[PDB]
């Protein structure tokens, strides 16, 4: 059995142009555990990405949170690139300002 | 209020790539307070909350010991599982384990858990009574029978009614400041247009702790507004959680629809 | 405080 990941790209604090924040990608509800999560700054991978320790919920549902220290702008476009077994090709979700 | 301790541990086999990876995490309600990772440099039980550093080298000596043993039992259990499910060595398999206890406001025993899931599906679980087992499929039945004969549940009962509660109480005192806290949700509200003759408006809860929140809406004072777009509670990263619920409305009735936010940091709920 | 998980599935 396999379960497709639920992806959520958002900020730690309420987003505002030019002010420091953390861009988060929250992958949950996936099985097996082996996941690839890339944070994007104009289609190009952010190499200094840190992640949460592999944990789960009572329903054995896997959860992780990959996060980065940044400064958001009006010019740059942010997103989350995710590939699992349940996914043929990477599924990218754009960081919607709201 | 009520409290809980939990240890979540995952074992993933890497056929030909060494010994299965063991990652064990401990929580007090929603606070990751301990960590163990087989592939990590440390090779010891590590702290993840400031209030656990006050535990002496003796604590970390013992805790590292128990967790390296659990690591071996599940290493043992993954090989066994291949036999019981008639599987190959070439495949990579997951073995998850969850154990802990719930305690009331008085820090007294309420519930105990001791369970396994192989390949994301339940295998064997400790019953609410703490005396017998729940063997999901046919294979687990072989484990249930030997464990019932040997009265294994007693070794678990002594931990859950004893050491688990005794230890959780101790954590609740030492970490009074951060653990007994209740961060209320920082209420927000946004509005965006669907396609001129339609519009969408969502409310947000953002700086709360614990993860328990109810973002239920209301149309014209009626509870009946179930066609809502609700998201999963997500962690901010600064030890706080957020959740939002967007509801579509007929352009001109944006003011007609109210939103009710339920949390324990607020004595009375918030209506927007 | 972690538990002693010292009994396997076949024991």
Author numbering:
A (entry chain B): 1 to 98
B (entry chain A): 1 to 272
C (entry chain C): 1 to 11
Give sentences from the paper:
HLA-A*24:02 allele, highly prevalent in Indigenous populations, is associated with influenza-induced mortality, although the basis for this association is unclear. Here, we define CD8+ T-cell immune landscapes against IAV and IBV, restricted by the mortality-associated HLA-A24 allomorph. We identify immunodominant protective CD8+ T-cell epitopes, one towards IAV and six towards IBV, with A24/PB2550–558-specific CD8+ T cells being cross-reactive between IAV and IBV. Consistent with the HLA-A24 peptide-binding motif generated by NetMHC4.037,38 motif viewer, enrichment of Tyr/Phe at P2 and Phe/Leu/Ile at P9 were observed.
As we observed T-cell cross-reactivity between the A/PB2549–557 and B/PB2550–558 as well as T-cell reactivity in transgenic mice for the overlapping peptide A/PB2549–559, we next determined the impact of those variations within the PB2-derived peptides. We solved the structures of A/PB2549–557, the overlapping A/PB2549–559, and B/PB2550–558 peptides in complex with the HLA-A24 molecules at a resolution of 2.90, 2.95, and 2.16 Å, respectively with clear electron density for each peptide. Strikingly, the extra P10-Glu and P11-Thr residues of the 11mer extended outside the antigen-binding cleft, creating an unusual conformation that disturbed the interaction between the peptide and the HLA-A24 Lys146 at the C-terminal of the cleft. Thus, the bulged conformation of the extra residues in the A/PB2549–559 may represent a challenge for TCRs interacting with the C-terminal end of the peptide. However, only the A/PB2549–557 epitope showed immunogenicity in HLA-A24+ individuals, with the instability and bulged conformation of the longer A/PB2549–559 epitope potentially proving challenging for TCR recognition. Structural analysis of the overlapping peptides A/PB2549–557/559 and B/NP164/165–173 showed that despite the difference of only two or one amino acids in length respectively, these peptides each adopted different conformations with HLA-A24 and are likely to induce distinct TCR repertoires. Our data revealed that A24/IAV-specific CD8+ T-cell responses were immunodominant (>5% IFN-γ+ of CD8+ T-cells) towards 2 PB1- and 3 PB2-derived peptides: PB1216–224 (mean of 10.2% IFNγ+ of CD8+ cells in spleen, 16.5% in BAL), the published PB1498–505 (14.8% spleen, 23.3% BAL), PB2549–557 (10.1% spleen, 24.9% BAL), PB2549–559 (11.1% spleen, 24.4% BAL) and PB2463–471 (6% spleen, 9.3% BAL). Consistent with this preference for PB2 and PB1 peptides, the CD8+ T-cell response in IAV-infected HHD-A24 mice focused mostly on four epitopes from PB1 (PB1216–222 and PB1498–505; 36% primary splenic response) and PB2 (PB2549–557 and PB2549–559; 31% primary splenic response).
